[PDB]
Amino acid sequence: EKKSINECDLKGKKVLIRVDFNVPVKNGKITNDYRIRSALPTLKKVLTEGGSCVLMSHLGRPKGIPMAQAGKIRSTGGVPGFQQKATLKPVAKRLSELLLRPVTFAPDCLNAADVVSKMSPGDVVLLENVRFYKEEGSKKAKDREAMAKILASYGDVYISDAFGTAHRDSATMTGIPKILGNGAAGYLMEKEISYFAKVLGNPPRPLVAIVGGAKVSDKIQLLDNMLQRIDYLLIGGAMAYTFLKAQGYSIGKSKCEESKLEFARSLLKKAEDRKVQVILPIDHVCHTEFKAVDSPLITEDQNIPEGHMALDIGPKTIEKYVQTIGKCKSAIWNGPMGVFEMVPYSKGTFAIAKAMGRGTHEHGLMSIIGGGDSASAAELSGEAKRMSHVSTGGGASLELLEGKTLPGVTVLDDK
Ligand SMILES: Nc1ncnc2c1ncn2[C@@H]1O[C@H](COP(=O)(O)OP(=O)(O)O)[C@@H](O)[C@H]1O
Ligand SMILES: [Mg+2]
């Protein structure tokens, strides 16, 4: 098992903490800071122990820029790879408010030596989005290490509290502990890993995996490796359209991974072979445009009219999904069933949340909800508190089904 912050000497040390501050943002504002709130304990620990924090995280999926191209930008005085919608700035502000102390925001994670050097115990520094640099997520270890070398020069001890990006073998996740030669798990990492651990071992079956949301291309690839664990696979959100089209239905202008259709088909084959009852939308809630509208189009078929885009699962689908969740003893959910941010497209998401919250509360249904947007929905409904666990990890919570040890976790000093 991995070493904890508890085992580290933090007094007077600059702790490099990789957190998951990839919170939901709209118009440059955080709409849900559950991922930040969840990281509070580890930061409190280091502050209480007399250390200082230099936090690293990513927001969104910015294009990134090669480190080489950065130098030129910095000469101009700009920020390498900067994308306004993916700044961690609002996160720095929020964190400062929760922590009740200043959080200095270093606008460039690879050019923060100055600020870092001036740190003293009690100080908290948040570096700009590490994903502003392509090397952070490069597949080329050489590349990751290049960037990690710099970041690693920022502190003494490293601790990872970013369960949520633990499935991401990245520069900040695995590269820094590698180059620094140490790494422990924060409290949140420990917590998530433990709850999942205890739960994924002896899950009360039937076990239904409800997966929705977006990020289809990546998320769809996690499904194959979770068929062995699950009994039911409910599919909603954008994820559904690729499956439905692969099956031969009309998808209209709905989100679809056209390059995954055969993959979808094969996965459905394996699902049958692995004794997994996969269920897709029966009907949909649609509209001609990605805009809310009181009373949008609700289909009868799995087919979506050419001019429409399905934005939520339909009533018949909500019924079957809720019904099957009722047939289970374990439920793992990731991804809203529709565009829950808009009232007319929120019924599916809140229905699943309700069923899970109710199942747990009235029958011990062991429920786990994961993901930033998912956590927001759970909180909006109020069912968050009624779940067995609401994880800060979405894809992380899904990858974890495969049984493999998350690289971010793995890289940690298992002591
Ligand atoms: N039918 C849909 N069409 C387009 N987007 C959708 C649809 N259903 C859900 N989404 C979007 O996908 C996002 C949530 O998915 P995802 O980001 O993968 O979730 P999480 O952060 O919980 O893991 C939301 O912004 C949601 O509106
Ligand atoms: Mg998201």
UniProtKB/Swiss-Prot annotation:
Pfam families: PGK
Enzyme class: transferase
Pathway(s) this gene product operates in, as recorded in its UniProt entry: Carbohydrate degradation; glycolysis; pyruvate from D-glyceraldehyde 3-phosphate: step 2/5
Location of the protein in the cell: Glycosome
BP term (GO), one: glycolytic process
UniProt: ATP binding residues: 214, 238, 310, 373-374
Catalysed reaction, written as an equation: (2R)-3-phosphoglycerate + ATP = (2R)-3-phospho-glyceroyl phosphate + ADP
Gene3D superfamilies: Phosphoglycerate kinase, N-terminal domain
EC identifiers of the protein: 2.7.2.3
Binding site for CDP: 213, 218, 237, 335, 340
Keyword match Methyltransferase: no
Keyword list, A-Z: ATP-binding, Glycolysis, Glycosome, Kinase, Magnesium, Metal-binding, Nucleotide-binding, Peroxisome, Transferase
InterPro entries: Pgk_euglenozoa (IPR027250), Phosphoglycerate_kinase (IPR001576), Phosphoglycerate_kinase_CS (IPR015911), Phosphoglycerate_kinase_N (IPR015824), Phosphoglycerate_kinase_sf (IPR036043)
HAMAP family the UniProt entry points to: Phosphoglyc_kinase (MF_00145)
Note: In T.brucei, three genes code for phosphoglycerate kinase isozymes, which are transported to different cell compartments.
Family (UniProt): Belongs to the phosphoglycerate kinase family.
Protein name as annotated: Phosphoglycerate kinase, glycosomal
Species, as recorded: Trypanosoma brucei brucei
